[PDB]
């Protein structure tokens, strides 16, 4: 079986890359400006100092993640202002200046789809999502203009049609197929990108994978805050009343269980919050690998990078995450043929060198693998070894010589 | 995003107000992470300057349907 | 930090167990040493858990190191930007205390001169394509070269193939293609 | 109890095996496109330099 | 292991002989020439 006809296909892909960098403090959470409590805690061990340690560790880890995944470029390339990319039309994913910040249409959709008293603050990230967008625009202009050469170093421009010819050549579909079908492939590309647009705008919230990081973290914070309302066995929950009601020599007692309960709650919180990030950065490392292998090059590794055979990938940002577009080659309309391993001619077998030997019923032909393109059998594309007896299973045919009739001139 | 007029040179950031840096108007491939784009360095008479970061050099490549 | 935790009372009378032994042996010794035990037990447990997480981290890095060894060393990879930066030639390992140190030997092209390209060279109505590499021009003499290092050669049937029409394809040029069999057939 | 049931998992392993016996790798990219086993093994050998 | 004769259909030509290290002579075969009998 072999395919007559094929479709370019465009798939989306989502990934978490980081999460909001909270930071909740010791003395405020536990008791918050009640120096009686402070004097009671100072002689507990060095617990909460090193809690603060761990948590700020998570916080710096987040921006380490974002810089490993996005700063995989070294400069800022930008696209030339004459959009003559040979039929292919990326105008939906490149920037548009009159959008307020330098987002892009699909970026802006992704942004519009997804949506204090207790010492617990939220630091701001170290890259501004504007800068993130500027990186991704740089990556787009890079992998578009310069081919994929800039994987190595100084970018080396090369026209887009040539580049996609090389992309095809990297999955065993000889160059010509592109040039002969350029217009068709271009229209396919365009309608696919447009379908992505209209899907995402009218999709369900199927950016859900980024939703889960934020929902989990925020519900954990709700539990931590709410925990402050439990008596924990003391006279009353509110510390400003326990202090202001009982005598000191009595106070120490009722404050004791309150301190131990709130500490144990804080430790449970930080213990879970460590594992949150310890898996987020696994995802982040996966995103860095996908970015470099897919965007700055081509991946011969079947189904690492969106399915079908692989051609090109484009990145886009998202709030605390990244979103790839994968552009792949897939065969759709197949058809029957009957084959055999080798062609015995004049007492010597022949095997083909790249493509399969294929028949339409009467004659025989040589074709490449993944897109039907019949040809005659000539000494050029085949090669010989030995008789035609050992090779199990065989069918007879005539091998034409591209030299004899020209020689017979 | 709160106001440092409430503090008991001077600047303002999306993360707070840092006290001491001369705020400058050029951007460098910058060292120290402060916040939300602002990032400091010791340079030149000499002091600490806190300033907007810049993601890198700009090299807009020439492209043409028949070059290589 | 763990050891320092032994110098703290956790809300008891002292930071040693022997003193509480000396002062008060009957039940109040229980209602005090209770706290020493509880606190010290936490400190140990909360050492163990974060040590366990750090262990997870090091195992992740160890498995990355294993894959990197058995791809960069014992073979030649084509995952791009895995073994270093640039096209990958080779690697050698070295061993540092508690870790490993890879020397990646990579091949990177630096000088760049530009030319003018074209998809195909029609002739007699048929269109040749290169077997590998692009066509290229210094202005007059079209040469065909591999994509990654400038060394030109003369265009030939033997390093091209055919598609016998030059109209559907967009952006062709015209030029003679050389043929080695004709001059050797002149004899 | 688990969601997929070990009988169902056996059906997936049977299918994912039948595919690779009959049609080579192709059924990971689209629809299966048949080749006879011997030829498929020949093309694997070609894929590793022999 | 699979010995073959050395001809134009399995070797290509790059440049001169006297710059590569440790080259040797041997007679390249040109299977056009036996057919170059006319
Ligand atoms: C590339 O695709 C975009 C996608 O819309 C095309 O944009 C339209 O361009 C026309 C100009 O002829 C405008 O009047 C429309 O408002 C644009 N949008 C739509 C939805 O039609 C664009 O024409 C295509 N080609 C180029 C060269 O940009
Ligand atoms: C191969 O497939 C492509 C699309 O999958 C076909 O393109 C369209 O085919 C229909 C059917 O005749 C035409 O009406 C359309 O005009 C074609 N599209 C364009 C943009 O022209 C293509 O015809 C198929 N070719 C073969 C030989 O099957
Ligand atoms: C199978 O392929 C052969 C090869 O092209 C086709 O045979 C051609 O048939 C037409 C008339 O039907 C002749 O004018 C051509 O000269 C034939 N070609 C050759 C090379 O002899 C054949 O039609 C195809 N289909 C079938 C069912 O056999
Ligand atoms: C596939 O197996 C069939 C068996 O039916 C082979 O058919 C040949 O012809 C008849 C079938 O009635 C048998 O007596 C022969 O022994 C079969 N030959 C062989 C080699 O099996 C068919 O040839 C086989 N396919 C290939 C490619 O060998
Ligand atoms: C390679 O790219 C450079 C950069 O655009 C081109 O440089 C200019 O080319 C024009 C036309 O010959 C000259 O008049 C200028 O003096 C060049 N600029 C410099 C700084 O030297 C160059 O032309 C391109 N190569 C070709 C063959 O066109
Ligand atoms: C590649 O881009 C150039 C840039 O405009 C195109 O140049 C035009 O080419 C046509 C036909 O070759 C001429 O009639 C025009 O006069 C050219 N433009 C100018 C400003 O002189 C060129 O056509 C493009 N290549 C292709 C294949 O379309
Ligand atoms: C390239 O060289 C060929 C070789 O003569 C010529 O092709 C002519 O192209 C024009 C363009 O329409 C045709 O009208 C002629 O019939 C073609 N043949 C001849 C003999 O003139 C022409 O010199 C060049 N072609 C182009 C498109 O530049
Ligand atoms: C391969 O190694 C051998 C062993 O050293 C080299 O043999 C020497 O070759 C030089 C040629 O300039 C002679 O003068 C020496 O006498 C040789 N050594 C001995 C022990 O006789 C050989 O040269 C090397 N290969 C090449 C191409 O130089
Ligand atoms: C390879 O063969 C060539 C020619 O067949 C040898 O070239 C000889 O070079 C010497 C110079 O030292 C001349 O005196 C000879 O006349 C040349 N020809 C022959 C046939 O000897 C060359 O020496 C050979 N290389 C080796 C390593 O033997
Ligand atoms: C295949 O062709 C050879 C060439 O003469 C012939 O001897 C042999 O009988 C043919 N095979 C069959 C099955 O007829
Ligand atoms: C706080 O700073 C913002 C930003 O400069 C400013 O708009 C606002 O007026 C300030 N608030 C006060 C009370 O000065
Ligand atoms: C801010 O930028 C302007 C731009 O002209 C410059 O004149 C001015 O000196 C800059 N401010 C400082 C403190 O350098
Ligand atoms: C192109 O290169 C050839 C060398 O084969 C040379 O003789 C010719 O003059 C060159 N043309 C230009 C315009 O540099």
Author numbering:
A (entry chain C): 713 to 827, 854 to 1147
B (entry chain B): 614 to 621, 641 to 676, 689 to 712
C (entry chain B): 961 to 1147
D (entry chain A): 862 to 911
E (entry chain A): 1110 to 1147
Q: What does the primary publication say about this deposited structure?
A:
The rapid spread of B.1.1.7 has increased concern about those natural mutations in the S protein, including 69–70 deletion, 144 deletion, N501Y, A570D, D614G, P681H, T716I, S982A, and D1118H. To improve protein stability for cryo-EM data processing, proline substitutions at K986 and V987 and a “GSAS” substitution at the furin cleavage site (S1/S2 site, R682 to R685) were introduced into the purified S protein, according to a previous report.
In the S-ACE2 complex structure, the interface between the S RBD and human ACE2 is clearly discernible, suggesting that the two proteins form a stable binding state in the absence of any crosslinker. Based on the structure of the B.1.1.7 S-trimer/hACE2 complex, we revealed multiple structural effects of those mutations on the S protein, such as enhancing ACE2 affinity, enhancing the prefusion state stability, increasing the propensity for the RBD “up” conformation, and promoting furin cleavage activity, all of which might effectively increase viral fusion activity and infectivity in the human airway environment.
